[PDB]
Short mmCIF file of N, CA, C and O in Angstrom, two decimals:
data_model
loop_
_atom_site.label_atom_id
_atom_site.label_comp_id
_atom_site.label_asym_id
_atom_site.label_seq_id
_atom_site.Cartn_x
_atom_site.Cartn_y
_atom_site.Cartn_z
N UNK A 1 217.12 98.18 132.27
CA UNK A 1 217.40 99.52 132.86
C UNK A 1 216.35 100.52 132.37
O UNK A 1 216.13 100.64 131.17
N UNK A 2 215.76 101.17 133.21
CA UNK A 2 214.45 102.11 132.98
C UNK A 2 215.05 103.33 131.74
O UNK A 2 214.66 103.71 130.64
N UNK A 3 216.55 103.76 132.93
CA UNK A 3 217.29 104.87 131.93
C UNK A 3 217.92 104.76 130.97
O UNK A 3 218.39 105.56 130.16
N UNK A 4 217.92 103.00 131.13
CA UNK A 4 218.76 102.58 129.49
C UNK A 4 217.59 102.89 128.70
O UNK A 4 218.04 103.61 127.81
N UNK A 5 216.44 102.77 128.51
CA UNK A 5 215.73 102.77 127.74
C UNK A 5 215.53 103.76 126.91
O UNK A 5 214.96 103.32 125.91
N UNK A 6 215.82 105.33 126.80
CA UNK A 6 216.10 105.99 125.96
C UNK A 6 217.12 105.62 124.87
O UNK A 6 217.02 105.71 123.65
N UNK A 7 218.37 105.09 125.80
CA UNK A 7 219.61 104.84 124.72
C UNK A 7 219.33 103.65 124.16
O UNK A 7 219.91 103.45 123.09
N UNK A 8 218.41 102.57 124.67
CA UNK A 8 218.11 101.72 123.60
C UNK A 8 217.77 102.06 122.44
O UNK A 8 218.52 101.53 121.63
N UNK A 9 216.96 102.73 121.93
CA UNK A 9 216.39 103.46 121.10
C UNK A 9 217.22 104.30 120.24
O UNK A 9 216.70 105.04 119.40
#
């Protein structure tokens, strides 16, 4: 997910 990628973090 592009926008998961903040909350991965």
């Amino acid at each position: 997910g592009e926008e998961e990628y903040s909350e991965a973090i």
